Amino acid sequence: KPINVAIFGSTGSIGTNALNIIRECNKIENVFNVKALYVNKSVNELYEQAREFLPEYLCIHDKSVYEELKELVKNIKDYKPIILCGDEGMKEICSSNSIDKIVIGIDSFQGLYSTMYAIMNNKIVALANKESIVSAGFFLKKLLNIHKNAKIIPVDSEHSAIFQCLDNNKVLKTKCLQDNFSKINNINKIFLCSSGGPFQNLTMDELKNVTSENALKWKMGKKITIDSATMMNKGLEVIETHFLFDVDYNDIEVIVHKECIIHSCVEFIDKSVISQMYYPDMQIPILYSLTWPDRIKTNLKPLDLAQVSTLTFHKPSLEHFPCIKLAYQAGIKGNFYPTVLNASNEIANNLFLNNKIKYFDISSIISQVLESFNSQKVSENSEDLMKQILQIHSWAKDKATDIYNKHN
Amino acid sequence: KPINVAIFGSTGSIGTNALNIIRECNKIENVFNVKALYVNKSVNELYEQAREFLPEYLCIHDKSVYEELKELVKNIKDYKPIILCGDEGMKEICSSNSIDKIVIGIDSFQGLYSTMYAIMNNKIVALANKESIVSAGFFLKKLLNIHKNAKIIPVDSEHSAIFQCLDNNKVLKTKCLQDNFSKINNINKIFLCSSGGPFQNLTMDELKNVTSENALKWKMGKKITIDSATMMNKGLEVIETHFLFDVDYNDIEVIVHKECIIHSCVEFIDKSVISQMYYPDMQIPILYSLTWPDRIKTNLKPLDLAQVSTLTFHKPSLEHFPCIKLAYQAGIKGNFYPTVLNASNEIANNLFLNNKIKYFDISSIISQVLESFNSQKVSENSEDLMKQILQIHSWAKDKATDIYNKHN
Ligand SMILES: NC(=O)C1=CN([C@@H]2O[C@H](COP(=O)(O)OP(=O)(O)OC[C@H]3O[C@@H](n4cnc5c(N)ncnc54)[C@H](OP(=O)(O)O)[C@@H]3O)[C@@H](O)[C@H]2O)C=CC1
Ligand SMILES: NC(=O)C1=CN([C@@H]2O[C@H](COP(=O)(O)OP(=O)(O)OC[C@H]3O[C@@H](n4cnc5c(N)ncnc54)[C@H](OP(=O)(O)O)[C@@H]3O)[C@@H](O)[C@H]2O)C=CC1
Ligand SMILES: O=C(CC[C@@H](c1ccccc1)P(=O)(O)O)N(O)CCCCCc1ccccc1
Ligand SMILES: O=C(CC[C@@H](c1ccccc1)P(=O)(O)O)N(O)CCCCCc1ccccc1
Ligand SMILES: [Ca+2]
Ligand SMILES: [Ca+2]
Ligand SMILES: [Ca+2]
Ligand SMILES: [Mn+2]
Ligand SMILES: [Mn+2]
Encode chain B in three state secondary structure: CCEEEEEECCCCHHHHHHHHHHHHHHHHCCCEEEEEEEECCCHHHHHHHHHHHCCCEEEECCHHHHHHHHHHHHCCCCCCCEEEEHHHHHHHHHHCCCCCEEEECCCCHHHHHHHHHHHHCCCEEEECCHHHHHHHHHHHHHHHHHCCCCEEEECCHHHHHHHHCCCHHHHCCCCCCCCCHHHHCCEEEEEEEECCCCCCCCCHHHHHHCCHHHHHCCCCCHHHHHHHHHCHHHHHHHHHHHHHHCCCHHHEEEEECCCCCEEEEEEECCCCEEEEECCCCCHHHHHHHHHCCCCCCCCCCCCCHHHHCEEECECCCCCCCHHHHHHHHHHHHCCCHHHHHHHHHHHHHHHHHCCCCCHHHHHHHHHHHHHHCCCCCCCCCHHHHHHHHHHHHHHHHHHHHHHHHHHC
Q: What is the DSSP string of A95-115?
A: H-TT--EEEE---STTHHHHH
Q: How far apart are the first and last CA of chain A?
A: 60
d(CA B27, CA B210): 46
Find the largest Cα–Cα distance for chain B: 63
d(CA B100, CA B106): 18
Q: Which of the 8 DSSP states describes residue A203?
A: -
B389 CB-side CA count, 13 A: 24
d(CA A180, CA A247): 9
Please give the resolution of this entry in Å, rounded to 1 decimal: 1.8
- Whole-number CA gyration radius for chain B: 21
d(CA B49, CA B19): 9
Residue count (chain A): 408
Q: Nearest residue CA, atom 18 of ligand 3?
A: A157
Inter-axis angle of helices B382-407 and B130-146, nearest 10: 160
Query: In this structure, are residues B127 and B133 in contact, taking their beta carbons and an 8 Å threshold?
Result: yes
Spell out the domains of chain B, with CATH numbers in brackets: 2-156 (3.40.50.720), 157-317 (no CATH), 318-408 (1.10.1740.10)
Q: Which of the 8 DSSP states describes residue A65?
A: G
Q: What is the DSSP string of A252-312?
A: EEEEE-TT--EEEEEEETTS-EEEEE-SS-SHHHHHHHHHTT------PPPP-HHHH-EEE
Q: Which atom of ligand 1 is nearest to the CA of A108?
A: 43
Measured from the CB, is residue A327 less than 6 Å from ligand 3?
no
Q: Which residues contact A244 (CB under 8 A, 6 or more apart)?
A: A133, A152, A154, A159, A162, A163, A176, A177, A181
Among candidates B270, B291, B312 on the partner chain, residue whose Cβ is nearest the Cβ of A288: B270
Test B277 with A273 for CB contact under 8 angstroms. yes
Chain A hits for B301, CB-CB cut-off 8 Å, are 271
Grouping H, G, I as helix, E, B as strand and the rest as coil, residue A129 is coil
Residue count (chain B): 408
Order of all β-strands in the sheet with A124-127: A82-85, A57-60, A32-39, A3-8, A101-104, A124-127, A151-154
d(CA A93, CA A103): 12
Q: Tell me the backbone φ, ψ of residue A28, rounded to 5 degrees.
A: -105, -45
d(CA A370, CA A238): 17
Measured from the CB, is residue B156 less than 6 Å from ligand 2?
yes
d(CA A284, CA A287): 5
Q: Which residues contact B334 (CB under 8 A, 6 or more apart)?
A: none
Handedness of CA B119, B123, B124, B130 (dihedral sign): negative
Test A276 with B273 for CB contact under 8 angstroms. yes
Burial class (CB within 10 angstroms; exposed 0-12, middle 13-18, buried 19+) of A295? buried
Burial B162-200 (b: 16+ CB within 10 A, else e): bbbbbbbbbbeebbbbbeebbebbbbbbbbbbbbbbbbb
Q: Which of the 8 DSSP states describes residue A224?
A: H
Q: Which residues contact A380 (CB under 8 A, 6 or more apart)?
A: none
d(CA A329, CA A183): 24
Order of all β-strands in the sheet with A262-268: A252-256, A187-194, A262-268, A273-277, B273-277, B262-268, B187-194, B252-256
**How many C-beta atoms lie closer than 10 Å to residue B371's C-beta?**
9
Test B278 with A272 for CB contact under 8 angstroms. yes
**How many C-beta atoms lie closer than 10 Å to residue A168's C-beta?**
18
Q: Amino acid identity of B217?
A: K
Q: Which residues contact A407 (CB under 8 A, 6 or more apart)?
A: none
Measured from the CB, is residue B286 less than 6 Å from ligand 2?
no
Query: In this structure, are residues A246 and B244 in contact, taking their beta carbons and an 8 Å threshold?
Result: no
Q: Which of the 8 DSSP states describes residue A217?
A: -
d(CA B351, CA B120): 35
Grouping H, G, I as helix, E, B as strand and the rest as coil, residue A406 is helix
Q: Amino acid identity of B239?
A: I
